[PDB]
């Protein structure tokens, strides 16, 4: 539970600075054509918020990328590519730490058992003789 807690924090930080990168990436070379929302790195948060809000308003910018930077198909695929690669693993990573706990515990539960049945079998003999 608390073990995996730190794991996501560093990953989200990777993701945070993955943002800082893609913000530094996007802003510079996507502005001057449609520079209302591509001046500041803030636009990447917007871009997040955009994606959170299922933008389809960069569809506009995508029409503008078809007019201005068709490469942006990549630099839209990029935001999509970067997000999934990030968010899944941070989740999977935790799925794993979630799935990793119980298997030990299952064996942990079975751990105490075999010895008990043995610790049982041992004193079980001590009556038919003593």
């Amino acid at each position, epitope marked *: 539970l608390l073990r995996a807690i730190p794991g996501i924090a560093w990953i989200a930080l990777l993701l945070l600075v993955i943002f800082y990168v893609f913000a530094v990436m996007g802003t510079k070379l996507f502005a001057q054509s449609f520079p*209302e929302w591509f001046g500041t790195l803030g636009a990447s948060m917007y871009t997040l918020f955009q994606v959170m809000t299922l933008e*389809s*308003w960069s*569809m*506009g910018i995508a*029409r503008p990328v078809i007019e201005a930077y068709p490469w942006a198909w990549i630099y839209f695929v990029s935001f999509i590519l970067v997000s999934s690669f990030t968010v899944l693993n941070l989740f999977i990573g935790i799925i794993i730490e979630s799935m990793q706990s119980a298997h030990h515990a299952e064996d942990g539960e079975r751990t105490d058992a075999y010895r008990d049945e043995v610790l049982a079998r041992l004193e079980q003999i001590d009556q038919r003789l003593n």
Partner: antibody
Amino acid sequence: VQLVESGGGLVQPGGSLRLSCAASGFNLYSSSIHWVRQAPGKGLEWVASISPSSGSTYYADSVKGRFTISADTSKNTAYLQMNSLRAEDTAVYYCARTSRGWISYGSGLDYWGQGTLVTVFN
Amino acid sequence: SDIQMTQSPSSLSASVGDRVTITCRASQSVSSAVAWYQQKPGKAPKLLIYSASSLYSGVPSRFSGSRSGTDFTLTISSLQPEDFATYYCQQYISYHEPITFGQGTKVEIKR
């Protein structure tokens, strides 16, 4: 709230009239105002849009440059100079705020301006 | 980008109390941020439906708008005194190149 719609009238071609829009019961400075003309027996035509906090030079292809819309925050006042009329643009024009600011809708027409009838042919 | 809010039908004559649906077709991927408004003749715009569902503060419940991707449709079931009306959509970008409002739907009262 109240929208100030004035500066209409009849004129001849090549003429340039400045359609004034002053802010009343709303901070335009954060808001954004758009202009759209209703031809007789026709619907709206989203002309332009703007301080929009940031200075959004936003205007439709129909009057692309032929008109230039702006505003004075200091007076809570806006303007729309439709130059170069053509008479094609002869239609009753009303300016309003679909503002993405603090005081208006953001979703659409927060209100409607009184509208002043412009007849550009003599 | 480009937008062409094709509203239908042309002539819409109906009796009072009846249920009426004003439909509009989107050219490209128009989002949830759809707007429709109705105004009496020589009367100011009245924003009807905000975000394609939200009635403006004071807007009666008598009318409502639905979304079906490309198809966006407004509907009213009970004729209000404002029976005779018009209907045009409005397609928005949060802040982007394309701006468009509807080609208009004449809502006539059939006598």
